[PDB]
């Protein structure tokens, strides 16, 4: 069975990618979900308007990822996360997010 | 130093994602490039009119990628690759591509 990838794309105020990425340094429970395999946090190069940060998560199945979304550790990790348009959100550089889902058809490691 | 990721995003005719991904099973030189680490080939899950396949390459540095992009082996792997729009591209389901580049700010492996 193929691996599954979920991407959370963050649209951010220009210049804020680096401080946003630093927030991902320490784990907050994702690693405890059966089926989680690994994660990458990327900054999109050569952007001219808003910054872009992608959070890529790789799982043994889509069910594993859904289990994480419904988990208590997901809620705990996101409790102090705010969008800029939230009532108490003005200081946040995070404008919006968009989730993308993928089937991993092939993988190769050197 | 951070890892680097290059993405080649293919727009494909509806239904051709699976046949296109099978073309990546066999290596054609990239494993010989110093700095190359791994690759994922993904199909986007959605309801669009076209299929979308992404080729994600992970490298020790942007230089490693640049070296590959300019190499004889890159040329070899792509010598029979055509777009639908190419003079001899009648058989190809590949409509277009776009390259994206990313700095990898963080990685975690279970
Ligand atoms: C709903 C809108 C979301 C926003 C604005 C957002 C943003 C953030 C931020 C800023 C962090 C770091 C939290 C901190 O500072 O402690 C975080 C955690 C994280 N987010 Fe999200 N997130 C959202 C939902 C999602 C979704 C849907 C995914 C699926 C890919 C995702 C993937 C991750 C991962 C893997 C972590 C680290 C979790 C851990 O270590 O346990 N997030 N998110
Ligand atoms: C000019 C536009 C491009 C098109 C239409 C295209 C399409 C393809 C296709 C269909 C294959 C399968 C091999 C075959 O059928 O012989 C392939 C090989 C491959 N492509 Fe591309 N590609 C392009 C440029 C790129 C770029 C810019 C990247 C950078 C990420 C890339 C990454 C790869 C990799 C990693 C392989 C396997 C290489 C190996 O095993 O040595 N391609 N390409
Ligand atoms: Mg910038």
Nearest to B44 among A17, A58, A100 (CB): A100
| Distance of residue B14 Cα from the nearest chain A Cα, in angstroms | 16
Own/partner long-range contacts of B95-98 (Cβ < 8 Å, ≥24 apart): B95/B10, B95/B11, B95/B12, B95/B13, B95/B50, B96/B10, B96/B11, B97/B8, B97/B9, B97/B10, B97/B11, B98/B8, B98/B9
How many angstroms is it from A50 CA to the middle of ligand 3?
9
The resolution, in Å, is 1.9
The residue whose C-alpha atom lies closest to atom 21 belonging to ligand 1 is A78
Domain residue spans of chain B: 1-110
Architecture of domain A1-110: 2-Layer Sandwich (3.30)
Contact (CB, 8 A) for A59 and B45? no
| Residues annotated within a binding site of A for Fe cation | 8
């Amino acid at each position: 069975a193929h691996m599954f990838m979920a991407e959370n794309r963050l649209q951010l105020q220009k210049g804020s990618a680096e401080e946003t990425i630093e927030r991902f340094y320490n784990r907050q429970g994702i690693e405890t979900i059966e089926g989680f395999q690994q994660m990458f946090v990327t900054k999109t190069l050569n952007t001219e308007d808003t910054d872009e940060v992608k959070i890529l998560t790789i799982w043994e199945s889509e069910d594993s990822f859904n289990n994480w979304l419904n988990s208590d550790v997901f809620k705990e990790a996101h409790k102090n996360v705010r969008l800029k348009s939230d009532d108490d959100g003005q200081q946040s550089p995070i404008l919006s997010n968009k989730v993308f889902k993928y089937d991993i058809g092939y993988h190769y490691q050197k």
